[PDB]
mmCIF file of C-alpha atoms in Angstrom:
data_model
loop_
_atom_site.group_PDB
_atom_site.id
_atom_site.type_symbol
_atom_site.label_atom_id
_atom_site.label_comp_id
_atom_site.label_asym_id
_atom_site.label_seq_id
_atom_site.Cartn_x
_atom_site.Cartn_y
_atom_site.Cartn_z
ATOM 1 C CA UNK A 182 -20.559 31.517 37.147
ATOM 2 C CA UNK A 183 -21.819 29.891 34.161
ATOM 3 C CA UNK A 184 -22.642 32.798 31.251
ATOM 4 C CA UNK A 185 -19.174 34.745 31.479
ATOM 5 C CA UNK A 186 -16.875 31.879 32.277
ATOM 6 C CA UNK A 187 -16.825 28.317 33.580
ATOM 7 C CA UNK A 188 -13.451 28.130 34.055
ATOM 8 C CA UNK A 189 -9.745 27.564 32.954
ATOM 9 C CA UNK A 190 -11.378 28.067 28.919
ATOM 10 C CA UNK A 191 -8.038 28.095 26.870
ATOM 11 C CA UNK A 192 -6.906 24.548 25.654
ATOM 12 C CA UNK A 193 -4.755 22.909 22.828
ATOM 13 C CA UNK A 194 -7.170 21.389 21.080
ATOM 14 C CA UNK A 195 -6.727 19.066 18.017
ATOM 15 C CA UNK A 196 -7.942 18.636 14.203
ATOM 16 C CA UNK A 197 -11.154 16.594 13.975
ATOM 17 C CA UNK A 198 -12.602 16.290 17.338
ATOM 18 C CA UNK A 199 -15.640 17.408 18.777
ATOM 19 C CA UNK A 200 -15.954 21.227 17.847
ATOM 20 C CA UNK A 201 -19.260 23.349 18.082
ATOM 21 C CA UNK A 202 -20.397 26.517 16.607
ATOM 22 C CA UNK A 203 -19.040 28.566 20.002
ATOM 23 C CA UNK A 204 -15.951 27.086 19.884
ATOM 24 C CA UNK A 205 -14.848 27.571 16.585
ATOM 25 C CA UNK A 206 -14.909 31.151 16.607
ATOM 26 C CA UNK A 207 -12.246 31.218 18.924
ATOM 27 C CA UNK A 208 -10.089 28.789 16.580
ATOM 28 C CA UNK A 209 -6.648 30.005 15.347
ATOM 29 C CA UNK A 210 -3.838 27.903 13.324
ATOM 30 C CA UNK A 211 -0.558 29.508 14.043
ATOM 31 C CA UNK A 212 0.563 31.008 11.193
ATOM 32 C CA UNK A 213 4.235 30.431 12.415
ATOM 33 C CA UNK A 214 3.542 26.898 11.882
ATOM 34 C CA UNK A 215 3.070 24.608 9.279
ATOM 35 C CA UNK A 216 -0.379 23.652 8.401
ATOM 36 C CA UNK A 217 -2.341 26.469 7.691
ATOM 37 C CA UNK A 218 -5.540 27.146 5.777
ATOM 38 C CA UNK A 219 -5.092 27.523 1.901
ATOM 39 C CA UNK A 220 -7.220 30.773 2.303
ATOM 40 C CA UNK A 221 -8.040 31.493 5.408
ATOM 41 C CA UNK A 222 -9.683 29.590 8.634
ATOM 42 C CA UNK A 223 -13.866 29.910 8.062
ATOM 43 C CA UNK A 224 -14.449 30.060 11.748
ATOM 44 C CA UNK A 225 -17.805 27.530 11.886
ATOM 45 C CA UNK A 226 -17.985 23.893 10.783
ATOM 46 C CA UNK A 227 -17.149 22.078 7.618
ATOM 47 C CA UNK A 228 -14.416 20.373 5.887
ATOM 48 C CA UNK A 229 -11.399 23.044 5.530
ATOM 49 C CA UNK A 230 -8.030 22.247 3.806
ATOM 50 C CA UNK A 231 -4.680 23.532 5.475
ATOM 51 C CA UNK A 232 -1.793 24.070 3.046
ATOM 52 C CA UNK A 233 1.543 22.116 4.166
ATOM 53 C CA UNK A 234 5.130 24.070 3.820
ATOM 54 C CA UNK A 235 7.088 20.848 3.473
ATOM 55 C CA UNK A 236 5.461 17.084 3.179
ATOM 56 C CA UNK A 237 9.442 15.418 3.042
ATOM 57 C CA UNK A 238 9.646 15.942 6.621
ATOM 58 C CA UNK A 239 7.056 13.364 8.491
ATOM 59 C CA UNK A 240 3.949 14.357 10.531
ATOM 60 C CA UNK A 241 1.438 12.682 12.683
ATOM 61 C CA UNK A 242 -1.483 11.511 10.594
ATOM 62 C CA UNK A 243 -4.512 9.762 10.943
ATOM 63 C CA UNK A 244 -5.298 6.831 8.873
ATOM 64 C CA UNK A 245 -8.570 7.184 7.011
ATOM 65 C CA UNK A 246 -11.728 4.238 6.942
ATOM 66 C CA UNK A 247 -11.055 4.096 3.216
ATOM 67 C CA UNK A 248 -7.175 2.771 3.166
ATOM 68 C CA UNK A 249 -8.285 0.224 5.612
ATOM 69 C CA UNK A 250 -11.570 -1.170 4.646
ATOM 70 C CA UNK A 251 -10.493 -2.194 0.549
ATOM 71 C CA UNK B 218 -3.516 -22.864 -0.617
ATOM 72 C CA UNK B 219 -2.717 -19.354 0.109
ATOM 73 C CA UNK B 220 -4.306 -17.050 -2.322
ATOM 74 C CA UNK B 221 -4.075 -13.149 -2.804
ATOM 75 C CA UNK B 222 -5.048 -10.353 -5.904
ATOM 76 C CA UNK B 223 -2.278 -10.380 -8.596
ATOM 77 C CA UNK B 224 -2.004 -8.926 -12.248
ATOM 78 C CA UNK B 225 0.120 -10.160 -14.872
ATOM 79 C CA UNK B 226 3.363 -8.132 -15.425
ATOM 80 C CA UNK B 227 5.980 -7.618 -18.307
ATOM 81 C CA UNK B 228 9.238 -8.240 -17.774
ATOM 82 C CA UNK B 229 12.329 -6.459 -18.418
ATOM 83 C CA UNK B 230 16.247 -7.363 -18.906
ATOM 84 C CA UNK B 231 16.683 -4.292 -20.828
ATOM 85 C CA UNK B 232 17.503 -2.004 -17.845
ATOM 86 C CA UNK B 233 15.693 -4.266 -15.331
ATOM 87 C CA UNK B 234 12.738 -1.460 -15.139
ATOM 88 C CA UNK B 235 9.785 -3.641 -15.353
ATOM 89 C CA UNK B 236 6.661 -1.868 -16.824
ATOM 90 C CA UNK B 237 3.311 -3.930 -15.574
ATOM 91 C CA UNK B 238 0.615 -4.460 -17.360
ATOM 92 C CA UNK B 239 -2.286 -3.778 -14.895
ATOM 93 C CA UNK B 240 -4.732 -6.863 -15.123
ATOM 94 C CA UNK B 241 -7.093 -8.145 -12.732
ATOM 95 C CA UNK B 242 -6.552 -11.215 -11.312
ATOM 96 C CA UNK B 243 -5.829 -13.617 -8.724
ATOM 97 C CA UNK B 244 -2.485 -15.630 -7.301
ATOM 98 C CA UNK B 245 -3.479 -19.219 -6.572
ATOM 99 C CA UNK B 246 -0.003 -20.394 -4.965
ATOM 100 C CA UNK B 247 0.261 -24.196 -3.482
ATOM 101 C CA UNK B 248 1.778 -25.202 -0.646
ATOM 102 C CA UNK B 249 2.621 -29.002 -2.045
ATOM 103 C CA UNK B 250 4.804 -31.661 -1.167
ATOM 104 C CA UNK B 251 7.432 -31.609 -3.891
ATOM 105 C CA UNK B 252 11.176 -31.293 -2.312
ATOM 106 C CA UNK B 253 12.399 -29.660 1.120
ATOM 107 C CA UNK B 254 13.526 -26.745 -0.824
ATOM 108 C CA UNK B 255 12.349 -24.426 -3.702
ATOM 109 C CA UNK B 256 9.361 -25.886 -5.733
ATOM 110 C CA UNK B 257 6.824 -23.794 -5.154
ATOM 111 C CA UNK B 258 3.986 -24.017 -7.904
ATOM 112 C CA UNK B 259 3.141 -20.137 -9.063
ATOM 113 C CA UNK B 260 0.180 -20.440 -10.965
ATOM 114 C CA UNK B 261 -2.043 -17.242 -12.203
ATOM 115 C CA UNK B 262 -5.190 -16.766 -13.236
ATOM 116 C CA UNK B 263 -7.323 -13.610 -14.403
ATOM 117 C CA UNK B 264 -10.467 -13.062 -13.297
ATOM 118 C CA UNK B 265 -11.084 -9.715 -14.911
ATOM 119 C CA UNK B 266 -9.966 -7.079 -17.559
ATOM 120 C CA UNK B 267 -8.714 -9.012 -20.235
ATOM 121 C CA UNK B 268 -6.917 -5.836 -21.649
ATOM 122 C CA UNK B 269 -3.320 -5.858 -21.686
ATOM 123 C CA UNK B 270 -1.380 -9.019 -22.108
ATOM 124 C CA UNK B 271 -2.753 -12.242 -20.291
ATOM 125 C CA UNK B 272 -1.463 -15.576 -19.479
ATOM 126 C CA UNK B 273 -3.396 -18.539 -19.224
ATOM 127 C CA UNK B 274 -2.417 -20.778 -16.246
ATOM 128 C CA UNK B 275 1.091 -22.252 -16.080
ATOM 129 C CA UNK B 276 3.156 -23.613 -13.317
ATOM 130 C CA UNK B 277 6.321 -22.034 -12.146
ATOM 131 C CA UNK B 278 8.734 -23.492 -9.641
ATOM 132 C CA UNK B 279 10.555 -21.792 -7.114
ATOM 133 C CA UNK B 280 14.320 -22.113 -8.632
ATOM 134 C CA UNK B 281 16.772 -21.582 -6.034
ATOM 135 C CA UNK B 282 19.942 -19.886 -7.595
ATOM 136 C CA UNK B 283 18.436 -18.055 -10.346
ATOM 137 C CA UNK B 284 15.114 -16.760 -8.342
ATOM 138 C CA UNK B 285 15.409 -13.388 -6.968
ATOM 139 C CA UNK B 286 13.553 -10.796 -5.225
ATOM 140 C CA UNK B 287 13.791 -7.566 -4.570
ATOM 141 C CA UNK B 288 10.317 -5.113 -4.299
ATOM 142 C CA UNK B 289 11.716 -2.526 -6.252
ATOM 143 C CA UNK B 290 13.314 -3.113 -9.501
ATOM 144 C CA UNK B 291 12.502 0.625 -10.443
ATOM 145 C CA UNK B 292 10.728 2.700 -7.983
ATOM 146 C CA UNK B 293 7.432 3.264 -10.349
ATOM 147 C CA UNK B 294 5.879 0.573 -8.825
ATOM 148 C CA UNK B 295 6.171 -1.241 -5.859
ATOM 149 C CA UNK B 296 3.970 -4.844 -4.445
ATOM 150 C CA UNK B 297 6.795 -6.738 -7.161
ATOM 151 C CA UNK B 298 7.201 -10.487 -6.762
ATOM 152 C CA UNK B 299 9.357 -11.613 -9.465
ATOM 153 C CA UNK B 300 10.594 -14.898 -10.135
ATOM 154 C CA UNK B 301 14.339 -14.856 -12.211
ATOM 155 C CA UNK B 302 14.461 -17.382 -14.896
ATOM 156 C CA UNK B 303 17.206 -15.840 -17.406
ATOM 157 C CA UNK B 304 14.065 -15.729 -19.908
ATOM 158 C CA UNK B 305 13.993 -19.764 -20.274
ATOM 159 C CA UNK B 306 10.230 -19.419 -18.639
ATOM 160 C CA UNK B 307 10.602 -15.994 -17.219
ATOM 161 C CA UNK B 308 7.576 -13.982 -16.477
ATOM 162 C CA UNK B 309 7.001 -11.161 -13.468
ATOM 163 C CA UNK B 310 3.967 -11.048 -11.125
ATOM 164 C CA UNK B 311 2.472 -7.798 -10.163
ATOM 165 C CA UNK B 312 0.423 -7.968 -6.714
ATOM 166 C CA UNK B 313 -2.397 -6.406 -6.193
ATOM 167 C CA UNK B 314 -2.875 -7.093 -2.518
ATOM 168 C CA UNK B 315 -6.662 -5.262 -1.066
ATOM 169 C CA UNK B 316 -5.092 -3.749 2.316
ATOM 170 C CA UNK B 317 -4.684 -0.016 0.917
ATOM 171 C CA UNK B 318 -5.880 -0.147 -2.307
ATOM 172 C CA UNK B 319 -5.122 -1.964 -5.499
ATOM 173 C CA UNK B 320 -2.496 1.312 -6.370
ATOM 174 C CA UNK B 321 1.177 0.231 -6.173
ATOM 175 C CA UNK B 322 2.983 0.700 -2.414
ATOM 176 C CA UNK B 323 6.932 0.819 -2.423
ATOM 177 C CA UNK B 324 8.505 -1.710 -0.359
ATOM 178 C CA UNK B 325 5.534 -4.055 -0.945
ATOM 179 C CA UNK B 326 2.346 -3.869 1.058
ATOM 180 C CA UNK B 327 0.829 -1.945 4.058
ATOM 181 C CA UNK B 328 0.896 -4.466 6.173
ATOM 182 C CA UNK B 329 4.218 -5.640 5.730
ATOM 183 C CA UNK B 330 5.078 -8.349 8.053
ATOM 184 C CA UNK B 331 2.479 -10.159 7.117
ATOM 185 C CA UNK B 332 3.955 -10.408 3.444
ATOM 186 C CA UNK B 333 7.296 -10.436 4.654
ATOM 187 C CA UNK B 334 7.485 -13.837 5.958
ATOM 188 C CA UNK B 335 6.118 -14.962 2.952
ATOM 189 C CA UNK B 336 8.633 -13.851 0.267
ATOM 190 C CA UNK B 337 11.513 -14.898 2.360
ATOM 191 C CA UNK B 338 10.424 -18.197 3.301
ATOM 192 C CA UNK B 339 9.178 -19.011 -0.244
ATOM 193 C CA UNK B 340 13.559 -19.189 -1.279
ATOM 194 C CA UNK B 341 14.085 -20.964 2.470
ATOM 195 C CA UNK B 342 12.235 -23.944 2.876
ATOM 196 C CA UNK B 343 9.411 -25.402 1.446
ATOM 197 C CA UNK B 344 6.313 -27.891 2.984
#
């Protein structure tokens, strides 16, 4: 099939990665989890800020073009 | 000739805090010939913002005995290279090291074995 499925469609799937307009409906931060949205999750593209619980402990980042290119 | 940002920074024996004075500038340090210990020349020179306190260029040898580092000397600012005289030439560097930023990083730099090997072997050995 193609239209209703094309199989095995639930993944993990990561902040800042390749994310269209169909598949960010289906988006949902767990809200029994750290980061989540200041407001609420916009469900479409665009720049969205998650609010963090507790910075002290250390997470998993990503290092941005700006630290490393001055 | 190894060369890197610095600013000028104030010094401190009151309660050994510290409190730079921002600058712009830039490091020249020479590698030399002088002894087989210590006597490294710290020279510095601005190169921009001339507000604040400045200090025209004057050589500073690596004492050993009376020369110590430590990066943190108060935990408001971190990058510190500081050069112990008992105030008989005493005056504090304040890097400014383009890796991260020029904003103060506790624990020096971002890329910290390269300055690591630096600041060590400055008090070890010399060329």
């Amino acid at each position: 099939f193609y239209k209703n499925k094309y199989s095995s469609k639930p993944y993990k799937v990561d902040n800042m990665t390749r994310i269209l307009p169909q598949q960010s409906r289906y988006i949902s931060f767990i809200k029994d989890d750290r980061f989540v949205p200041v407001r609420k999750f916009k469900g479409n593209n665009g720049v969205v800020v998650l609010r963090d619980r507790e910075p002290k402990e250390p997470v998993a980042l990503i290092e941005t073009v700006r630290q490393m290119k001055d | 000739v190894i060369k890197f940002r610095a600013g000028v920074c104030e010094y401190n024996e009151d309660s050994r805090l510290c409190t730079p004075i921002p600058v712009q500038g830039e490091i020249e340090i020479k590698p030399n010939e002088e002894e087989e210990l210590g006597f490294w020349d710290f020279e510095w020179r601005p190169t921009e913002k001339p507000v604040g306190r400045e200090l025209d260029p004057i050589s500073l040898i690596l004492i050993p005995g009376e020369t110590m580092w430590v990066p943190i000397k108060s935990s408001k600012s971190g990058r510190i290279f500081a050069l112990v005289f008992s105030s008989n030439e005493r005056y504090f560097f304040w890097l400014q090291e383009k890796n991260s930023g020029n904003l103060p990083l506790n624990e020096l730099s971002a890329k910290d074995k390269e300055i690591y090997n630096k600041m060590i072997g400055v008090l070890n050995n010399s060329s």
